[PDB]
Amino acid sequence: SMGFKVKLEKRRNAINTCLCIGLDPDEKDIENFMKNEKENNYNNIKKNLKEKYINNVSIKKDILLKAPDNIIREEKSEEFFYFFNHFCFYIINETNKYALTFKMNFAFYIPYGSVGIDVLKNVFDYLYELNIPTILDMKINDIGNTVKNYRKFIFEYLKSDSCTVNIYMGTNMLKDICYDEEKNKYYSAFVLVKTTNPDSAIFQKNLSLDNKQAYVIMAQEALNMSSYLNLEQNNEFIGFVVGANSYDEMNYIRTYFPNCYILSPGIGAQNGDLHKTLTNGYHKSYEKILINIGRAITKNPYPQKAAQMYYDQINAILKQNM
């Protein structure tokens, strides 16, 4: 067990990027994949079937290994499962060489009931086999007794490396998310600090304590809690979600918490500025500034090339900042 701090550093050394690929497939993405595959003689599924680690996923592997034409006539109930899982495998196979991390937003995997949670588990199994660091974006929050269920789901069942957390209820929830006292285990989390929605100022900026805006108070309390838990000693961390349209806050956070880990969504579909974001959030250890791109890759019909462009542009910008 490396610990997520170490997993990130080592993969950064191998692939020299901070691109975080977001995998948030929606119903139209899955439908479109099925339709295109049905028309292009299942070219991408056939490619997926040749990859080594498809043989290691834990749920309904023998369904996933069946030929598509046979799924449709013999395992029709499993059609949606099969195409949803294969869409995810396809995106991962096409793009993983460019990704420091993958982030999966739980919301996209739940709305069909159990079936998408089987897909989600298989996606985490597949990434684990590929040794790619993972983030589950679920924005979890509850009282201690309740949130230990999320710890189990995220860190034991999915074996995620990290997750996102909303600490507005308080910053003691992290004791039951990032630490398992009975097992002496430690896990990493990114807490929400400044988000990308257009009205994010209403609580994050307009509330304050002793003339520091709420987002700074929350960031500091999160770090206070990380220190309490001794995460960084155990190769784990609490970091910050700072939107990639929030340049002032990104600048402020990187200046006043010089060595914090930042996860930054909002470039591509939400129109954030890549150059400004990466420059204001820059750190020499650039795994500390994860640039998440979801729909601009997954809704691109040429996702390998989409991911490659972001990888190449991030690397150009990192070079300028170095």
Tokens of 242: 């700072």
In degrees, rounded to 5, the angle at the alpha carbon of residue 291 between the alpha carbons of residues 119 and 175 is 70
Establish whether 295 is an annotated binding residue. yes
By CB under 6 A, residue 241 contacts ligand NUP: yes
By CB under 8 A, residue 144 contacts its own copies: yes
By CB under 6 A, residue 94 contacts ligand NUP: no
| Helix, strand, coil fractions of the chain, as percent rounded to 5 | 55, 15, 30
By CB under 8 A, residue 56 contacts its own copies: no
By CB under 6 A, residue 195 contacts ligand NUP: yes
DSSP 226-270: HHHHTTGGGT--EEEEE-TT-HHHHHHHHHHSTT--EEE--BSTT
- Judged by CB under 6 A, the residue of 5, 21, 24, 128 near ligand NUP is 24
- Judged by CB under 6 A, the residue of 9, 75, 79, 142 near ligand NUP is 142
Catalytic residue among 139, 185, 205, 299: 139
Tokens of 232: 């960084």
- Judged by CB under 6 A, the residue of 3, 25, 116, 243 near ligand NUP is 243
By CB under 6 A, residue 294 contacts ligand NUP: yes
State yes or no: is 60 an active-site residue.
Answer: no
By CB under 8 A, residue 112 contacts its own copies: yes
d(Cα 13, Cα 257) in Å, to the nearest integer?
23
What residues are designated binding site? Answer: 24, 103, 105, 139, 142, 146, 196, 270, 294-295
| Catalytic machinery residues | 139
Binding site for ligand NUP (CB under 6 A): 22, 24, 105, 137, 142-143, 146, 164, 195-196, 241, 243, 265-266, 268-270, 292-296
